[PDB]
């Protein structure tokens with residue numbers, strides 16, 4: 001739902017830089033609230049765990 | 051100097067310390083991990 | 094012994110003076126076969142890292158590894174730690190991302206950095222704060238990890254401090 | 258199925274057990290850098306290497322900061338996000354049992 005979405009490239013050929021929205025995507029994964037789950041309701045804590 | 055110091059200080063104790071791995075494809079006790087706790091190189 | 098010094102850098106220093114940096118040295122030579130492998134790498138992607146490490150380990154069984162860096166990619170050294178988890182070779186990290194502080198090493202690893210831990214750096218900073226008698230302070234951290242060990246070390250150091 | 262009429266699609270990529278961990282790292286690094294995957298999951302409990310090490314996958318994807326989702330491993334040494342730069346898991350480690 002946002003702009004500034006880059007792509008992690010084929011890093012083996014001339015790409016030593018990091019992916020730019022790495023921590024942004026990781027923060028989206030940290031802030032991912034859920035209310036549906038087969039094993040149960042899943043939510044990430046401050047340690048990124050169930 | 052640290053590497054040669056550890057190798058020379060352990061070589062006096064045991065000789066067959068260099069025990070490497072041949073290659074990554076197709077896959078020792080006396081090691082330098084716990085021996086070089088101290089080191090001395092030109093003071 | 095057989096030691097490979099690889100430099101993934103952008104600071105232009107050639108490699109033959111690295112051979113001369115060993116050549117007239119080692120006055121008391123106790124090993125009888127010591128070789129230097131001075132290599133310069135321009136791209137530090139992990140495919141080429143593991144490829145050159147496997148080539149040098151197949152390169153007449155090199156027993157020593159020294160790696161320097163001028164970038165800010167710390168996990169390469171952690172990559173070397175994984176190499177240190179598998180190749181059973183003592184690995185040294187010089188500077189840049191090769192020696193940025195990782196938290197806990199492994200008995201399965203023999204990796205080492207050339208730097209100061211965050212605990213010893215906190216000890217130096219508290220020594221600085223003690224030498225100016227700046228006895229009142231406030232500790233401010235974000236949720237960037239390593240903060241709990243930082244707070245616990247500072248509290249145990251203040252509990253072992255003559256300052257009050 | 259239920260995710261709108263947008264043109265996005267999802268391809269599957271899976272690699273299996275190898276007894277040699279360096280060649281595990283080789284299979285993971287080539288087969289996932291050459292594929293441009295955006296999310297990587299690890300589901301290998303039953304290894305003869307009983308140290309439970311998904312470390313090369315985590316380090317390789319955290320080089321370019323790609324998230325690795327642990328699914329069965331429960332060691333609290335993976336909770337350090339400063340070592341494992343892009344590792345998360347939805348299973349509790351044993352320390353949370355405390």
Ligand SMILES: *[C@@H]1O[C@H](CO)[C@@H](O)[C@H](O)[C@H]1NC(C)=O
Nearest residue numbers: 001002003004005006021024
């Ligand atoms: C993307 O980044 C640019 C940088 O200038 C910023 O202006 C823009 O607001 C960002 N996109 C969003 C969040 O709409």
Ligand SMILES: *[C@@H]1O[C@H](CO)[C@@H](O)[C@H](O)[C@H]1NC(C)=O
Nearest residue numbers: 035036037038039040041042
């Ligand atoms: C635990 O299991 C139940 C079903 O027995 C379900 O409500 C959900 O998966 C979990 N709810 C909790 C946390 O009690």
Ligand SMILES: *[C@@H]1O[C@H](CO)[C@@H](O)[C@H](O)[C@H]1NC(C)=O
Nearest residue numbers: 059060085086087088089090
């Ligand atoms: C270093 O350790 C060795 C082995 O214990 C010992 O023989 C030597 O005296 C030590 N040297 C110094 C100066 O600590």
Ligand SMILES: *[C@@H]1O[C@H](CO)[C@@H](O)[C@H](O)[C@H]1NC(C)=O
Nearest residue numbers: 107108132133134135136141
């Ligand atoms: C720079 O790196 C490339 C890629 O490995 C290599 O082919 C070339 O020989 C390197 N040049 C130097 C100065 O080592």
Ligand SMILES: *[C@@H]1O[C@H](CO)[C@@H](O)[C@H](O)[C@H]1NC(C)=O
Nearest residue numbers: 266267268269270271288292
């Ligand atoms: C999807 O991945 C498979 C396995 O690598 C590959 O054979 C296939 O060509 C891919 N298809 C797409 C969407 O490119």
